[PDB]
Design a protein around this ligand. Structure first.
Ligand SMILES: Nc1nc2c(ncn2[C@@H]2O[C@H](COP(=O)(O)O)[C@@H](O)[C@H]2O)c(=O)[nH]1
Ligand SMILES: Nc1nc2c(ncn2[C@@H]2O[C@H](COP(=O)(O)O)[C@@H](O)[C@H]2O)c(=O)[nH]1
Ligand SMILES: [Cl-]
Ligand SMILES: [Cl-]
Ligand SMILES: [Cl-]
Ligand SMILES: [Mg+2]
Ligand SMILES: [Mg+2]
Ligand SMILES: [Mg+2]
Lengths: 308, 313
C-alpha cells in the first residue's frame, strides 16, 4: 500500500497531458458513464471568464468532457455574473448557496458551497482569471482519474513562460510540506487552482475558507485516500501573475498546517495572542508603520454531514 | 507587540554619529564590526572604505572584521588591501571542520571579535551608507536596558521585507512568536548586541541563523530589551526563487527545532509515516522544466553550534 517515498510516487504518478488526448478521454468517460462539473470560483473576472467558458465549449465539441460549468461569483461589481451567463455558463452567488451559514468567507467557502450545486460524478476546480486559456487546462487533470484505476485526486502542474511555482508556493507551501508533510513534497504546483476529484471525496472532507483552502484540501485528501491515489499532470506553459497581499496568503497557508498539526497532536500548546490578528510591519517613506489585518479562519465540515 | 513597536522603533536621524562617538567614549565601550563575506570582491572594498570614512568623522568602530568563505573571487585579498582584518571561516574554530554556511561563519567570528559590542554587517551591499553601520548602535548606547538592536529599512510602497521575510518569517512569527511581529526586517543582516550575549546562545548554521538568533535572544533578554532602527533605503540583492526555497526551509527548520525544544511540537514525524519519507536534511524541490517535470533534491544537515563560551578557550 502506497509508494515507498516521494521519489517513487513522483515517477509513478506524474503525467504529461500529451498522454491523454481529449478524444480518448471522452471515450473512456463515456464508457464509464461518468459526468464532470467544472467549477470556476469567480471574483471580478469579467474580461477572462467569457473566453474560458468559450474554450470549454469548443473542447466539448471536439471531445465531450465537461457536462456542467459553474461560475460561483463573489457578487462582482464588474458584471462577471452577466458575462458568464451570456456565454452559456450557470451562475451562482457564493452568498446565496448554503445561505444559512451567512455571507461567504472568501475563496474556500465559495468552493465548498459549490458542492451543493455540482451534479457531476467528478468535480474539477478551475481558476477563472486565466488570461490565455488552453484546452488542456480543463482536460489534462482528468487523464489519470479516467485512465488509471486507483487515482482519485489529480493536481495540475505547469511552468511560467525551471519553475517551482509562485512565491507563496516556493516560500511557504513547499518548505512547510517538506517538513510536516513529506508525502506532498513531490507536487510541482501544490496550490494550483486546477485539480479534480470525485464529488464523494470532496463531500467527505472539511473545507478551510479563504486562502487556506488549497492547502487544506491537499492535507485532507492525503489523509483520506492515501498518497498513492493522488497524481499530477504537466499542462505545459501557463502565464500566471503584490508581495503585500501575498503575506496574508502565506499566513493562511501557515494557519492551515498549524491547525492540522494541532488536530494530529503534533502541535500541542501553541495578550499579544490572537490567530486571526496578523501584524504586518513595514517601512514607508513616512517612517515605520505597523499595519494590522484580521481574517477569520473557518473550517466548514464535510458537506456530507449537512446534505442528504 | 504594539506597545513594543511604539516604544522601541527609532529613526537613525535620532543618533547623529558624533553624539554616539561621544557617548561611546564616555561609556568606554568598544565596537567590533563583523562582515561575513562570500564572493563579495566587488563590494567589501567600498564598505570598508565608508567605515574608515565614518571613523574619521566619528570614532565608532574599533575593529573591522571580514570573515571570508574562502571566496574564489578574491574577496579576502580585497578586504585585506582595504585595511580590514581578514580571517577564513575555515581557520576559525577549525576543530569543527569546514564551516557550514553563513551561520557558522558568524558563530566562528566571535572567537576573534575583540569588542564589547558586536555589530554584524552584510558585505554584499552594492551601495553602502554610513548609517548602515551606526544606526543600530543608537539604542544600545543611549536607551537603558536595550541589549539587542535590529536594522529596519526599505527598498528603493510599503516594504515589508524580502520574499523570505514576507512569506516565511513573518507568517511563522505571527503564529508561533507573536512578540517578533513588530520587526520590519526580522532577518536583517545588520544588528548589534553585547559580545557576552552572542557568546551565550547557540547559533544555527547556514541560513537558519538569523531566525535562531531572533528567537534565542527574545527568550534570553526579553522583548523590552530589543529594538529597531529605520536606516532609510537599502538596495537588496535579487536572488533566484529556487535558492530562496532552500532558505525558507532553513527558516522553517529553525522555528520547528525551537518549537520542539519548547515542547510545543510533540512529534515531528507523523505517526504512520514510513521512515523512508522522513529525512529533514533532504529537501525535495519539485519543478517544471522545458523538458518535463523533475524532482530536484538538496541535502543540507541543520548543524547547530553550542554557545561559544562552552567551547572557546
Ligand atoms: N467566488 C469567489 N472566487 C474567488 C475569491 N477569491 C478569488 N477567487 C477566484 O478564484 C480564482 C483564483 O483565486 P486567486 O487565489 O488567484 O485570487 C480566480 O478565478 C478568482 O477570481 C472569492 O473570495 N470568492
Ligand atoms: N563567511 C561567509 N559569509 C557568507 C556565507 N554565505 C553568505 N555570506 C555572506 O553573508 C552576508 C549575507 O548574504 P546572504 O545571506 O543574503 O546570502 C553577505 O555578506 C554574504 O556574502 C558563507 O557561507 N560564509
Ligand atoms: Cl479564528
Ligand atoms: Cl530539527
Ligand atoms: Cl539535520
Ligand atoms: Mg491566481
Ligand atoms: Mg543578501
Ligand atoms: Mg525530506
Amino acid at each position: 500500500l502506497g509508494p515507498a517515498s516521494a521519489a517513487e510516487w513522483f515517477r509513478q504518478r506524474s503525467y504529461d497531458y500529451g498522454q491523454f488526448p481529449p478524444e480518448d478521454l471522452a471515450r473512456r468517460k463515456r464508457e464509464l458513464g461518468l459526468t464532470v462539473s467544472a467549477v470556476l470560483p469567480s471574483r471580478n473576472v469579467a474580461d477572462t471568464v467569457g473566453g474560458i467558458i468559450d474554450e470549454i465549449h469548443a473542447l466539448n465539441e471536439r471531445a465531450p468532457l465537461i457536462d456542467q460549468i459553474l461560475v460561483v461569483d463573489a457578487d462582482s461589481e464588474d458584471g462577471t455574473a452577466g458575462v458568464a451567463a451570456s456565454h452559456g455558463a450557470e451562475v451562482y452567488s457564493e452568498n446565496e448557496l448554503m445561505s444559512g451559514y451567512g455571507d461567504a468567507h472568501g475563496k474556500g467557502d465559495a468552493m465548498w458551497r459549490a458542492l451543493s450545486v455540482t451534479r457531476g460524478d467528478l468535480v474539477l476546480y478551475i481558476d477563472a482569471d486565466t488570461r490565455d486559456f488552453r484546452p488542456q487546462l480543463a482536460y489534462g487533470v482528468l487523464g489519470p482519474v479516467l485512465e488509471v484505476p486507483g487515482v482519485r485526486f489529480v493536481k495540475a502542474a505547469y511552468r511560467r513562460p525551471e519553475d517551482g511555482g509562485g512565491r507563496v508556493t516556493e516560500l511557504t507551501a513547499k518548505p512547510l510540506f517538506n517538513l510536516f508533510y513529506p508525502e506532498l513534497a513531490g507536487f510541482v504546483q501544490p496550490l494550483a487552482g486546477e485539480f479534480v476529484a470525485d464529488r464523494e471525496l470532496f463531500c467527505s472532507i472539511p473545507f478551510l475558507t479563504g486562502y487556506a483552502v488549497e492547502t487544506g484540501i491537499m492535507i485532507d485528501v492525503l489523509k483520506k485516500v492515501g498518497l498513492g491515489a493522488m497524481a499530477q499532470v504537466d499542462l505545459g506553459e501557463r502565464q500566471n501573475r503584490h508581495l503585500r497581499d501575498l503575506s496574508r496568503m502565506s499566513y493562511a497557508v501557515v494557519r492551515a498546517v498549524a491547525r492540522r498539526l494541532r488536530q494530529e497532536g503534533r502541535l500541542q500548546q501553541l495578550s499579544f495572542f490572537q490567530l486571526s490578528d496578523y501584524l504586518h510591519a513595514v517601512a514607508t517613506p513616512e517612517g515605520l508603520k505597523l499595519q494590522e489585518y484580521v481574517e477569520e479562519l473557518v473550517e466548514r465540515p464535510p458537506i456530507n454531514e449537512v446534505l442528504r
